[PDB]
Ligand binder design. Structure first.
Ligand SMILES: Nc1cccc(OCc2ccccc2)c1
Ligand SMILES: Nc1cccc(OCc2ccccc2)c1
Ligand SMILES: Nc1cccc(OCc2ccccc2)c1
Ligand SMILES: Nc1cccc(OCc2ccccc2)c1
Lengths: 265, 265
């Protein structure tokens, strides 16, 4: 992978692996999400971040954390195919930061998917959210395009829709979900992609066998700790559309909420 | 990746990814195992497999793993390039063996080795059988015909008999269930998921203070998508050795047994 000519975006190619595909021999949405993280990390490294935070951030013990992830897939790449992913970041003033991605088939050059994520500042120790200070923005603004560059430009698009809270009883559920060590990242936190998998676990297998996932919007409200247990809840709201809710098994504390849109095969 | 000059082995390079590493910023043993599967599949594809021979497809037979043995000297770091060489050998009418050698691409030093024993099985009835002479003649032309062992040594760990753990186990992790990401393209639980489940019952303190040097795992029976597993471990031993057992949560049917060897950091 490499920074583009202007140094304001990063591109990387990936060959889809045998264990990365589902029953139709195409990449799962979790494989796509993992690739989005990898190209994101390679972009941060290429622009000088140490092995993820600016100078003012490390001084105040602040980190970027995902508040929302939105992914739209038109075609899932096949096992052995080469997918090219371009990524960039944009300041959203004092609110936070946005990271966007564009996925293309390397052989045809056609856009096969797009993603957008909203990040907010948080104290690493207290978990308290904060606005982006003047000093932090000045430090990372030089690595972003300064005029708008949106993966989802269209007005009233799906990435900005407000998601409601699922009401009990849920139509479908998968309970007792727990992370194993492979679900943890280098910092021993549950990987953001694991939550996508947990959301999808409550979708009936018949829907998965007869439909393709076209869109997924996921809000991240609270982290699942390594010793926590999660219940995944889903209700059809409709193409098939679903409303999702992940909550802690015991006290019912919300950790995520989301929506999925599926197209008939 | 590519076949070597003689066409009797295959090599491929992999760059270690951000989400593939643990707390020490080095590849987990499950990431290594996944890479072993990928290079294995790329080798089968390079030698003409659509992976079953003509006689195998007619008799509805497949290769299935009976045992996996991995030894790691150094886990590659995040961003490092690891080169893996793989080959197969006929083991007469008993079955087949696939071996691997892992090297640091920059230094050329051997950083790990692996060996696996495969047996023929009817895809539908799950009944094991010997390798017929017709099947052997079909794949022998893709193997070195003189011995080529990743584990040559006389009384090496790869061929040790593993006993059955007796209740009560010293440590346990109960209620483990596969999610969709744990399944392969054929909707079977991926062989690497069982390695993760075995390791779940090792206490976190051992993981934090030791590095896994050796893992031997026997595959006795499959965990179905709707099954629940219990992972059991007892210390048998500066090095720490453990005895492992995976069994179905309800009836206690054995699915795997194994051993691990850990060295102090
Ligand atoms: N941890 C990480 C690192 C780099 C980018 C990144 O993008 C946000 C995201 C990716 C996949 C799923 C959900 C959110 C996340
Ligand atoms: N923690 C983390 C992980 C992965 C990517 C990342 O992006 C930082 C960044 C790169 C380029 C421009 C602006 C910001 C931060
Ligand atoms: N499914 C598969 C495909 C190709 C090679 C392969 O090697 C055996 C193995 C690898 C990793 C863990 C346990 C066993 C397995
Ligand atoms: N089912 C399966 C999956 C992955 C590899 C594989 O190896 C087949 C093979 C390749 C080269 C020589 C002899 C045999 C079989």
């Amino acid at each position: 992978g490499s920074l583009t000519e202007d140094g304001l975006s990063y591109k990387e190619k990936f060959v889809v692996r045998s264990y990365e595909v589902g029953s139709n021999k195409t990449a799962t949405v979790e494989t796509i999400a993992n690739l989005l993280q990898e190209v994101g990390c390679n972009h941060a490294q290429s622009v000088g971040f140490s092995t993820a935070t600016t100078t003012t951030m490390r001084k105040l013990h602040l980190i970027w954390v995902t508040a929302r992830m939105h992914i739209e897939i038109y075609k899932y790449p096949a096992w052995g195919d080469v997918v090219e992913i371009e990524t960039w970041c944009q300041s959203e003033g004092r609110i936070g930061t946005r990271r966007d991605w564009i996925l293309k088939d390397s052989v045809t050059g056609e856009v096969t998917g797009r993603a957008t994520s909203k990040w907010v500042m948080m104290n690493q120790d207290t978990r308290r959210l904060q606005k982006v200070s003047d000093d932090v923005r000045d430090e990372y603004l030089v690595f972003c395009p300064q005029e708008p560059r949106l993966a989802f430009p269209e007005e009233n698009n799906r990435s900005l829709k407000k998601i409601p809270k699922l009401e009990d009883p849920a139509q479908y559920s998968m309970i007792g979900l727990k992370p194993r060590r492979a679900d943890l990242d280098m910092n021993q936190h549950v990987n953001n992609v694991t939550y996508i998998g947990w959301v999808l676990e409550s979708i009936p297998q018949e829907i998965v066998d007869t439909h393709e996932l076209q869109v997924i919007t996921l809000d991240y409200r609270r982290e699942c700790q390594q010793d926590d247990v999660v219940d995944s809840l889903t209700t059809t709201t409709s193409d098939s559309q679903f409303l999702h809710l992940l909550r802690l098994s015991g006290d019912g504390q919300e950790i995520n909420r989301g929506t999925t849109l599926w197209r008939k095969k």
